[PDB]
RNA sequence: ACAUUUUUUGGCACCGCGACCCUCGCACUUGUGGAGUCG
């Protein structure tokens, strides 16, 4: 029901720890009540970027640990 | 509404511990919690399932992937229940 | 329509229950929730090639219970009536 | 009718009940699996008189005429 | 003051500094605890023999201070200030046990008491609050 | 009896010894009834023997055990009381199933319908 | 243990608790949920590595019901 | 313009194949619903691209599905 | 803020190279062009291509990949 | 509460506390950190005051894990008390 | 009172143990000396 308060993390680069012991990086552009994430693109953790912007599904997110403070 | 949720909310401010499905325990000041246990935490250490530990700043965790949360024992006293 | 109702109607039955992790559970169903959370009494947990562990009271969760093995004698049509 | 299941159980049985979740009350029940710790090859099956079933288990039901 | 079911049911129950029950001449009727305790405190009682227990799978700590234990019929066993007098009376502990305390028992002053315990109860790692060492 | 209950939670000959030792008396008869019900062979008759070590209902259990031994059970029924309806039930079991067993009960009953 | 109807009626009893990962949480149920989440008063996680019981005292714990398998009664109140 | 549900509707009485959470399938689609549970005829079980058996008339549960294809 | 639904819509409008990751499945990915949109994450994606991940290329037709097993999008 | 110092700081914290509990249970129903500041020390809290006094007199200089422990009454009252 | 992402329609299944040495300190605890060897 309530919105995930990620307005602190808006327009900052975040380590999206994602399903299956994987990772994603990138600057936060948006989100919704299901915790889907819209982010301006970055690499999959040696390293290799795919995409210009990226959208991560809600279910898939383990964590979204902030790279910037 | 859920009393565990309420408890979690109350624990805001306090240093909660927090393990996930992965089995990666965290400890930190609980910044914010929601009805779905969508926890944020500050000044947080992060243990790997195998053993090794890593310091980190402001972790967010989605309650779906959370397993169990340890709250400080002062909250036992009052006045939610 | 609802199997939940049927489950509810099944009371005081000494039954085996099978879980998603394969644990065989011999006990008397004292009650079941609307969401299939089984509440047993006189319970007996055995695995599917190792020794047994008995317990007085077990509240098993609805998501875990794969198959509840029903009793020997049971009138099903009657049960299925609203 | 036969049912395929998440845990490798071919449930050959007579259907009694049916709902939104695809939970089923079953009579004349005959499951088929294989208790086997590798390398080994065994094919096992047991009769059960009456049996309730949960729906998340069900992958694909089928009807052999 | 028999150790009875009624006695156990009104006994202080708490989480210690493990689940512990706060507790007599003879140890009996433990069935009523229902195997729900990690620790049982039997200090300051008049028990003569450490015996009479039902099957208790939980029970990991037994504090039996200041009783009259003279014979023995589990990870920690504290028997301080009791009546065990002969090295051979400690033999039944070989069948259990990592923390053992037998201080203030006459048996303590017997020649070779420490080495005897170490060889006959090798599973003990700490004896009388001192590390069992290799030497 | 609570120790017998905890021991029951813990729960064959030695176990039978522990149970018989565990068996106020009405609860023990209820336990023997629990044994007669749970066993529903010869071991149940042994439970009846332990029950003897512990009456018309016991005779009914003896009927469930079903021939001279049954006559011995009838002798136990005679031991149970000098005489009122339960004795008539004993004569009834005697008549329903040894013609002398029925004729004797008919004689004691004799002691227009 | 007593012969209860529901979980709610047996509040504050010392509880064994199993979870999908195989750990065993033991402690007094302070509060229940619509989704079977449990508050435990004095919680001890007991785990078994692939041998013998490893033990950890936690404290006051909110425990999510998703991960909960089944609950058993360890002892009476107090 | 083409959403999924309408596509699904269109594809009734036509060949389809389904992967699972894994084994491939192959059969003619009978009907579908909002939850994306399936009912097929002439079902063939492609065990990683190997038609192990031909079952015929089947009903696939939605949550085990991975994707639909012609 | 840019919502996910909005992003999806934009992608659809565009018709661009989309590379989807599978939930709880590392080794495989999908690569195609978004055609459909749903209330949930489910979409239809014509001219799709299955990819084995670098720890080549494989043939694949038109597909709807179900919303529950999606992970990543990019377009 | 009694304050103990001169303790062998090589014992792991949970083992130290459990032996401390065991040893001191003989006098009545019964805090230790390994920080630089607090290592080799412990505060043992008893329900009864007579128990604390008896413990102090009887275990003064008791060899524990190799060293003679030094016991004293704590400076302040324990939060729990 | 009801199944399509956060709970119950599941992604299931096939620091410690030997050695050495540092610290004598009045607390409320993720954890706690350091060098070196073993796992």
């Amino acid at each position: 029901v309530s919105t995930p308060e990620l307005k602190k993390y808006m327009d900052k680069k975040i380590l999206l720890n994602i399903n299956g012991s994987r990772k994603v990086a990138g600057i936060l552009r948006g989100y919704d009540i299901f915790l889907n994430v819209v982010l301006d693109d970055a690499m999959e953790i040696n390293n290799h970027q795919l995409g210009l912007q990226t959208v991560i599904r809600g279910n898939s997110i383990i964590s979204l640990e902030a790279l910037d403070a | 509404n859920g009393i565990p949720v309420k408890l979690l909310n109350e624990a805001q401010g306090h240093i909660v511990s927090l393990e996930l499905t992965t089995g990666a325990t965290y400890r930190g000041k609980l910044v914010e919690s929601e009805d779905s246990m969508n926890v944020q935490l500050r000044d947080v250490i992060a243990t790997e399932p195998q053993g090794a530990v890593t310091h980190m700043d402001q972790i967010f965790v989605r309650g779906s992937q959370i397993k169990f949360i340890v709250v400080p024992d002062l909250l036992k006293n009052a006045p939610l229940f | 329509m609802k199997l939940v109702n049927f489950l509810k109607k099944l009371r005081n039955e000494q039954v085996t229950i099978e879980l998603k992790n394969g644990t065989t559970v011999w006990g008397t169903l004292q009650s079941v929730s609307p969401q299939m959370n089984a509440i047993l009494t006189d319970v007996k947990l055995t695995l599917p090639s190792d020794n047994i562990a008995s317990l007085q009271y077990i509240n098993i969760r609805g998501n875990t219970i794969r198959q509840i093995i029903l009793p020997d004698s049971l009138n099903l049509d009657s049960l299925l009536v609203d | 009718v036969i049912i395929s299941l998440r845990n490798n159980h071919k449930i050959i049985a007579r259907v009694k009940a049916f709902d939104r979740h695809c939970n089923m009350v079953l009579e004349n029940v005959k499951e088929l699996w294989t208790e086997k710790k590798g390398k080994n090859v065994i094919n096992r099956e047991r009769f059960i008189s009456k049996l309730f079933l949960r729906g998340d288990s069900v992958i694909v039901v089928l009807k052999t005429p | 003051m028999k150790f009875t079911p009624s006695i156990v049911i009104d006994a202080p129950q708490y989480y210690v500094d493990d689940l512990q029950l706060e507790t007599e001449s003879m140890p009996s009727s433990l069935k009523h605890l229902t195997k729900p305790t990690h620790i049982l405190d039997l200090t300051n009682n008049d028990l003569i023999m450490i015996p009479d227990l039902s099957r208790r799978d939980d029970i990991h700590t037994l504090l039996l201070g200041r009783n009259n234990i003279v014979e023995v019929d589990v990870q920690n066993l504290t028997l301080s200030n009791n009546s065990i007098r002969r090295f051979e009376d400690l033999q039944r502990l070989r069948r259990a046990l990592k923390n053992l305390t037998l201080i203030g028992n006459q048996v303590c002053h017997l020649a070779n008491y420490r080495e005897h315990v170490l060889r006959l109860v090798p599973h003990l790692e700490t004896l009388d609050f001192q590390n069992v060492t290799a030497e | 009896e609570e120790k017998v209950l905890p021991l029951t939670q813990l729960d064959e000959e030695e176990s039978t010894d522990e149970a018989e030792l565990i068996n106020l008396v009405k609860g023990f008869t209820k336990g023997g009834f629990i044994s007669e019900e749970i066993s529903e062979g010869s071991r149940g008759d042994i439970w009846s023997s332990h029950i003897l070590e512990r009456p018309q209902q016991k005779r009914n259990e003896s009927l469930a055990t079903l021939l001279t031994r049954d006559n011995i059970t009838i002798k136990s029924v005679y031991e149970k009381y000098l005489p009122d309806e339960n004795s008539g039930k004993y004569l009834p079991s005697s008549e329903l199933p040894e013609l002398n067993f029925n004729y004797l009960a008919s004689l004691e009953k004799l002691g227009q319908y | 243990v007593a012969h209860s109807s529901r979980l709610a009626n047996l509040i504050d009893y010392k509880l064994r608790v199993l979870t999908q990962d195989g750990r065993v949480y033991i402690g007094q149920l302070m509060a229940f949920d619509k989704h079977m989440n449990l508050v435990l008063n004095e919680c001890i996680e007991e785990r078994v590595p692939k041998i013998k019981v490893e033990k950890r005292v936690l404290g006051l714990t909110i425990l999510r019901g998703e991960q909960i398998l089944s609950t058993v009664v360890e002892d009476k109140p107090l | 313009p083409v959403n999924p549900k309408p596509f699904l509707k269109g594809l009734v009485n036509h060949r389809v194949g389904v992967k699972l959470k894994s084994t491939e399938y192959r059969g003619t689609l009978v009907s579908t619903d909002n939850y994306f549970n399936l009912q097929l005829n002439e079902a063939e079980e492609f065990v990683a691209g190997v038609s192990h058996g031909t079952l015929g008339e089947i009903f696939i549960r939605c949550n085990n599905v991975l994707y639909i294809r012609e | 803020m840019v919502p996910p639904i909005n992003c999806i819509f934009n992608f659809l409008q565009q018709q661009t190279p989309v590379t989807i990751w599978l939930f709880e499945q590392i080794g495989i990915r999908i690569k195609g062009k978004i055609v459909g949109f749903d209330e949930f994450m489910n979409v239809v994606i014509d001219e799709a291509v299955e990819i084995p991940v670098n720890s080549k290329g494989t043939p694949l037709g038109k597909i709807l990949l179900k919303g529950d097993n999606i992970t990543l999008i990019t377009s | 509460t009694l304050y103990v110092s001169q303790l062998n700081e090589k014992i792991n914290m949970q083992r130290l506390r459990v032996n401390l509990f065991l040893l001191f249970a003989t006098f009545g129903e019964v805090v230790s950190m390994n920080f630089k500041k607090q290592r080799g020390q412990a505060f043992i809290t008893m329900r009864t005051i007579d128990q604390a006094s008896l413990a102090q007199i009887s275990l003064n200089g008791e060899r524990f894990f190799g060293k003679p422990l030094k016991v004293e009454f704590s400076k302040s009252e324990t939060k729990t008390l």
Side-chain angles (χ1 to χ4, degrees), chain A residues 1-4 6-40 42-69, chain B residues 1-9 11-42 44-81, chain C, chain D residues 1-30 32-44 46-65, chain E residues 4-6 11-12 16 21 23 25 27-30 34 36-37 41 43 45 51 54 61-63 65 67 69 74 77-79 82-83 89-90 93 96-97 100 104-105 107 111 113-114 117 121-122 126-129 132-134, chain F residues 6 19 27 31-32 41 44 55 64 83 88 92 97 105 111, chain G residues 1-49 51-73 77-78, chain H residues 1-23 25-70, chain I residues 1-46 48-49 51-55 57-75, chain J residues 1 3-5 8 10-11 16 20 23-26 28 30-31 37 39-42 45 48 52 55 59 61 64 66-68 76 78 80:
Chain A
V1 182
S2 60
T3 55
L6 303 165
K7 297 187 77 172
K8 303 304 297 191
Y9 301 119
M10 268 299 301
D11 306 314
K12 291 187 179 182
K13 214 185 188 75
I14 321 187
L15 291 171
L16 274 69
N17 212 134
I18 51 153
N19 186 237
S21 188
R22 303 177 292 186
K23 293 198 176 63
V24 184
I27 195 176
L28 196 75
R29 177 57 66 173
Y31 48 81
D32 68 333
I33 64 99
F34 295 103
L35 199 84
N36 304 329
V37 175
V38 186
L39 67 106
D40 221 304
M43 309 211 186
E44 324 299 302
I45 321 308
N46 278 27
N47 223 4
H48 44 274
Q49 188 166 328
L50 283 303
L52 290 307
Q53 59 271 68
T54 37
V55 191
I56 316 304
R57 176 171 148 89
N59 179 219
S60 59
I61 305 168
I62 295 299
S63 163
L64 49 103
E65 198 270 316
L67 204 162
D68 200 295
Chain B
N1 203 47
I3 294 171
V5 167
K6 284 182 197 187
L7 209 203
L8 187 55
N9 220 329
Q12 178 162 354
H14 286 87
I15 303 287
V16 307
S17 268
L18 177 65
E19 197 176 303
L20 311 198
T21 53
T22 59
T25 68
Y26 307 110
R27 197 138 177 108
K29 276 196 172 180
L30 199 170
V31 175
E32 179 165 347
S33 272
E34 295 150 39
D35 201 306
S36 55
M37 300 203 292
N38 291 174
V39 189
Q40 287 165 49
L41 307 88
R42 263 180 210 285
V44 77
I45 73 96
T47 75
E48 195 184 329
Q50 282 77 353
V53 307
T54 53
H55 190 92
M56 40 183 67
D57 302 289
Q58 265 199 288
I59 198 171
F60 178 100
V61 191
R62 185 189 147 99
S64 61
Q65 299 291 328
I66 292 169
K67 181 169 202 307
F68 78 102
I69 318 195
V70 194
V71 174
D73 301 54
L74 286 157
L75 283 78
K76 192 190 302 182
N77 289 352
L80 151 69
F81 308 122
Chain C
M1 292 282 194
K2 289 174 160 277
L3 266 52
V4 167
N5 286 24
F6 154 80
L7 287 162
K8 281 182 175 183
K9 272 177 282 202
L10 297 178
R11 297 282 188 76
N12 316 341
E13 308 299 338
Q14 300 221 56
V15 293
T16 314
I17 304 180
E18 187 180 309
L19 306 185
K20 238 272 218 303
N21 71 326
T23 310
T24 58
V25 183
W26 246 109
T28 315
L29 278 168
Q30 255 235 99
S31 49
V32 185
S33 74
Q35 302 158 313
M36 212 200 293
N37 300 309
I39 301 158
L40 296 159
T41 50
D42 312 321
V43 194
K44 183 163 65 65
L45 303 173
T46 316
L47 280 73
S49 62
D50 253 305
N51 284 27
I52 308 167
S54 57
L55 294 167
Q56 175 50 224
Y57 175 92
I58 305 193
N59 178 40
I60 309 173
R61 202 167 193 280
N63 72 314
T64 49
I65 295 163
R66 179 106 64 178
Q67 294 159 55
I68 303 167
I69 300 161
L70 300 177
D72 298 42
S73 56
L74 200 62
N75 302 319
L76 310 189
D77 289 49
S78 60
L79 285 162
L80 288 165
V81 176
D82 295 17
Chain D
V1 289
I2 320 185
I3 305 168
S4 61
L5 230 72
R6 264 321 285 205
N7 61 335
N8 305 341
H9 274 239
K10 295 177 280 292
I11 296 170
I12 304 162
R14 195 75 72 79
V15 176
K16 204 77 181 174
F18 147 75
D19 64 341
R20 291 170 62 80
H21 313 306
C22 306
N23 297 2
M24 314 192 87
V25 177
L26 304 175
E27 274 195 323
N28 323 324
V29 185
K30 184 65 167 181
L32 262 158
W33 72 105
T34 159
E35 179 163 341
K36 149 186 165 186
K37 299 217 160 191
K39 212 167 171 192
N40 201 347
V41 182
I42 305 169
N43 296 53
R44 190 168 294 184
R46 66 182 182 171
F47 262 105
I48 299 174
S49 307
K50 297 177 182 62
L51 183 138
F52 189 82
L53 178 67
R54 190 183 169 79
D56 114 285
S57 328
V58 170
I59 314 183
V60 187
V61 185
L62 65 101
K63 187 172 170 177
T64 54
Chain E
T4 230
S6 300
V16 70
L21 172 68
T23 289
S25 39
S28 54
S29 300
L30 284 183
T34 293
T37 301
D41 195 342
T43 300
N45 278 295
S54 27
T61 288
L62 260 174
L63 302 177
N67 285 261
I69 302 300
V74 188
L77 178 62
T78 313
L79 279 173
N82 273 282
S83 288
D89 291 310
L90 307 183
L93 302 167
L97 192 67
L100 180 56
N105 280 251
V107 72
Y113 153 81
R114 194 180 175 71
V117 177
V121 195
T126 184
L127 167 67
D128 296 338
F129 310 104
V132 170
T133 286
Chain G
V1 60
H3 211 259
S4 182
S5 183
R6 278 136 173 165
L7 186 85
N9 290 30
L10 53 79
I11 197 167
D12 306 326
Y13 282 69
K14 187 70 171 290
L15 253 72
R16 250 194 149 201
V17 182
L18 313 185
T19 56
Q20 278 178 347
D21 294 21
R23 297 157 160 81
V24 180
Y25 300 94
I26 69 98
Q28 299 181 15
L29 180 141
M30 298 233 77
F32 66 89
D33 210 318
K34 184 159 65 173
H35 315 261
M36 253 272 287
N37 303 40
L38 306 180
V39 185
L40 307 172
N41 187 289
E42 229 305 320
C43 190
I44 316 181
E45 188 183 311
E46 300 183 311
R47 195 168 63 78
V48 180
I51 302 158
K52 194 165 190 170
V53 176
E54 185 271 310
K55 197 164 176 180
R56 188 198 282 93
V57 180
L58 298 171
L60 175 48
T61 64
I62 302 159
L63 174 46
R64 186 164 180 75
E66 180 171 304
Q67 296 300 315
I68 290 166
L69 293 170
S70 53
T71 56
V72 186
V73 185
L78 291 164
Chain H
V2 178
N3 300 348
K5 70 169 186 182
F7 155 75
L8 193 69
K9 283 178 190 189
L11 210 55
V12 170
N13 61 77
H14 214 267
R15 271 202 178 183
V16 286
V18 182
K19 214 74 173 70
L20 304 172
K21 312 250 225 175
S22 188
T23 304
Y25 265 65
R26 181 59 57 188
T28 55
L29 181 52
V30 184
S31 44
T32 53
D33 65 330
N34 293 315
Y35 290 84
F36 304 97
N37 301 59
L38 306 171
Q39 182 185 315
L40 276 63
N41 297 342
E42 290 212 322
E44 307 188 340
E45 188 174 47
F46 278 109
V47 178
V50 177
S51 58
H52 177 266
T54 61
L55 303 166
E57 189 170 41
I58 66 88
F59 161 79
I60 306 181
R61 184 148 208 71
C62 55
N63 79 314
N64 294 267
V65 175
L66 223 177
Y67 51 72
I68 310 304
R69 67 191 300 277
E70 188 204 325
Chain I
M1 195 191 296
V2 177
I5 289 160
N6 275 220
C7 216
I8 290 159
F9 249 110
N10 289 13
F11 298 161
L12 198 160
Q13 284 170 17
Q14 290 161 32
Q15 308 176 11
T16 20
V18 177
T19 72
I20 306 169
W21 285 28
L22 311 192
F23 178 89
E24 195 56 34
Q25 199 145 295
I26 301 156
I28 303 161
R29 288 172 194 167
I30 303 297
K31 293 185 177 162
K33 299 195 165 173
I34 294 155
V35 173
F37 160 80
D38 201 57
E39 65 191 319
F40 311 110
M41 297 293 296
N42 201 333
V43 293
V44 60
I45 170 155
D46 295 33
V49 186
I51 314 292
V53 176
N54 180 40
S55 301
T58 65
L60 196 152
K62 70 97 63 251
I63 287 200
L64 93 78
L65 189 136
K66 197 177 145 176
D68 288 63
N69 273 297
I70 294 171
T71 314
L72 276 63
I73 312 290
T74 167
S75 155
Chain J
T1 300
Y3 167 73
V4 307
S5 70
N8 164 352
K10 302 217 88 137
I11 308 303
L16 177 70
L20 282 168
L23 178 60
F24 290 107
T26 74
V30 181
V31 186
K37 176 157 172 215
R39 69 190 294 99
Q41 301 156 86
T45 309
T48 309
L59 296 185
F64 186 66
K67 327 181 61 144
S76 71
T78 283
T80 284

